């Protein structure tokens, strides 16, 4: 049917951030709806959602997402 | 059949963040609805949703997500 | 048949975060609804949801999520 | 048949967080609803939900989640 | 029916967190509903939900969750 | 200094209130502060602070309030 | 000299309200502050602060308020 | 000399409201500040602060308010 | 100084309101500030701040307000 | 100084409102500011600030407001 496979087989500076905020409003991945049917949110990676957000060397391997929404098939 | 599979088999700087905020409002992954039917949220990775959020070497292997929603199939 | 499977078989630097907030409001993975049928939230990874959130070497292995919602099938 | 499986068979710096918060309000994985039928929350990983939340080397093995909700089949 | 299985067979820095809060309100994995039928919450990992939360080397093995809810099957 | 005087000398329908609440939260005359030096509240009248509040013919006479605060002299 | 004086000397229908609420939050006369010095609240009249608040023939006489705040000199 | 005086000397229909609320949030006379010095709220009349608020024949007399704030000199 | 005065002497119809709301947020006389010195709010009349607010024959006499703020001199 | 005065002496139709709201946000008299000195709000009349607001025969008498803000001298 719906298959997702991922494999990770292996034969194994300065980043300054200076901030100053006042009255910050932040939204990340958002899904606002009204009279819908499904609301699927699959996160395989990273979602950094700061007022001050820093990400370093974040996602290094084998992501796999398989989604199937609906399919009435009457 | 909804199948997910993940395998991780292995034969084995400075980051200053200076923050100063005042009245921050932060939302991460949000899902707002009225009169829906399913609300599926699968996180295979990382969701960092601070006012000051830092992620370092975060996700590094074998993420597998399989989602199948709805399917009336009458 | 909804199947997940994960295998992790293995044959085996300064992080300063200086913060100062005042009246911070933070929401992580949120799901708000009315008149729904299912609300599935599967976390195979990490959800860091601070005012000051730091994640380091967070997710390093064999994440498998298999979600199958709805399925009236008649 | 909803099956999960996981195996982890192994044949085997500085982290400074300085915080100062006044009146912080924090929510983690939240599921708010009215007139739902199921509310399933499976955590195979970590949910760190502080005002000052730090996670190091958090999830490193064989996470398996298999969820199957609804299924009227009538 | 609903089978889970997990096996873990093995044949073998500095953390400074300085916090200062005043009137911090913290929630974690929460599930709020009215007129619902099932409310299932399975934790196979860790939920750290302090005002100050630190989790080091948290989840290192063989997590397996298998959930099957609803199933009217008339 | 601070004088208040009040004299009252007297010589000689249908109310339907149908309410149906659920989880009501009510605050009346409120005063919230930090590091304040004085916090004075004088009520010469009526303070009706219900979830369902009905007031009829409440205050009919000689209210006198004399408030004098501070005076760091 | 802060003086308040009031005198009241007398030498002498259908009201239907129908309410149905759910999750009501109500604040009346509110005073929120930080690092203030005085917070004076004098009420000479009526403060009706319901979720369903009804006031009829409420205040009918001789209200006097005299407030004098601060005066560092 | 902050003076307030008031005198009231006297020598001798259908109202239907039908409401339906869900998740109502109401604030009346509100005063919000940070790092202020004085916060004076004198109410001589009526403050009706419902989700459903009805006021009939509310204030009919001799209201007198005298306010004097500050005056550093 | 600051003087007020008011005298009220006297020698003596269908109103249908049909309402239906959902998620109503209402504010009345509001005062929001940062680093102020005075915040004076005097009400000599009526402040009806409902979600469904009705006022009938509300204010009918002798309102007097005197206000004097500041005066650093 | 700052004086006020007011006197009210006297010697002795269907109105239908039908409303439907969903997600209504209403503000009345508002004063938003930062780093100011004074914030004065005197109400001598009526302030009706509903989602559905009706005011009938509201203010019929002798309003008087005197305000004097500042005057550094």
Curated annotation (Swiss-Prot), chains A, B, C, D, E:
GO terms for molecular function: actin binding; alpha-tubulin binding; beta-tubulin binding; calcium ion binding; copper ion binding; cuprous ion binding; cysteine-type endopeptidase inhibitor activity; dynein complex binding. GO terms for cellular component: actin cytoskeleton; axon; axon terminus; cell cortex; cytoplasm; cytosol; extracellular region; extracellular space. Residues 7-44 are annotated as: 4 X 11 AA tandem repeats of [EGS]-K-T-K-[EQ]-[GQ]-V-X(4). Phosphorylated, predominantly on serine residues. Phosphorylation by CK1 appears to occur on residues distinct from the residue phosphorylated by other kinases. It is found in: Cytoplasm; Membrane; Nucleus; Synapse. The modification Phosphoserine is found at residue 64. Sequence repeats lie at residues 19-33, 34-44. Highly expressed in presynaptic terminals in the central nervous system. Expressed principally in brain. Cu cation binds at residue 27. One of its GO terms (biological process) is long-term synaptic potentiation. Changing residue 34 to K: Increases oligomerization. The keyword Cytoplasm applies. The keyword tRNA processing does not apply. Keywords: Acetylation, Alzheimer disease, Amyloid, Cell projection, Copper, Cytoplasm, Disease variant, Membrane, Metal-binding, Neurodegeneration, Nucleus, Parkinson disease, Parkinsonism, Phosphoprotein, Repeat, Secreted, Synapse, Ubl conjugation. It is linked to Genetic alterations of SNCA resulting in aberrant polymerization into fibrils, are associated with several neurodegenerative diseases (synucleinopathies). SNCA fibrillar aggregates represent the major non A-beta component of Alzheimer disease amyloid plaque, and a major component of Lewy body inclusions. They are also found within Lewy body (LB)-like intraneuronal inclusions, glial inclusions and axonal spheroids in neurodegeneration with brain iron accumulation type 1. Parkinson disease 1, autosomal dominant: A complex neurodegenerative disorder characterized by bradykinesia, resting tremor, muscular rigidity and postural instability. Additional features are characteristic postural abnormalities, dysautonomia, dystonic cramps, and dementia. The pathology of Parkinson disease involves the loss of dopaminergic neurons in the substantia nigra and the presence of Lewy bodies (intraneuronal accumulations of aggregated proteins), in surviving neurons in various areas of the brain. Neuronal protein that plays several roles in synaptic activity such as regulation of synaptic vesicle trafficking and subsequent neurotransmitter release. Participates as a monomer in synaptic vesicle exocytosis by enhancing vesicle priming, fusion and dilation of exocytotic fusion pores. Mechanistically, acts by increasing local Ca(2+) release from microdomains which is essential for the enhancement of ATP-induced exocytosis. The 'non A-beta component of Alzheimer disease amyloid plaque' domain (NAC domain) is involved in fibrils formation. The middle hydrophobic region forms the core of the filaments. The C-terminus may regulate aggregation and determine the diameter of the filaments. Belongs to the synuclein family. Soluble monomer. Homotetramer. A dynamic intracellular population of tetramers and monomers coexists normally and the tetramer plays an essential role in maintaining homeostasis. Interacts with UCHL1. Interacts with phospholipase D and histones. Interacts (via N-terminus) with synphilin-1/SNCAIP; this interaction promotes formation of SNCA inclusions in the cytoplasm. Interacts with CALM1. Interacts with STXBP1; this interaction controls SNCA self-replicating aggregation. Interacts with SNARE components VAMP2 and SNAP25; these interactions allows SNARE complex assembly and integrity. This is Alpha-synuclein. It comes from Homo sapiens. The lineage of its organism: Eukaryota, Metazoa, Chordata, Craniata, Vertebrata. The chain holds residues 14 to 97 of 140 of the full protein.
């Amino acid at each position: 049917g719906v298959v997702a496979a991922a494999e990770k087989t292996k034969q194994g500076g300065v980043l300054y951030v200076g901030s100053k905020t006042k009255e910050g409003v932040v939204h990340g991945v958002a899904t606002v709806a009204e009279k819908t049917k499904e609301q699927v949110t699959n996160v395989g990676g990273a979602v950094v959602t700061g007022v001050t957000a820093v990400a370093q060397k974040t996602v290094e391997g084998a992501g796999s997402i398989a989604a199937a929404t609906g399919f009435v098939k009457k």
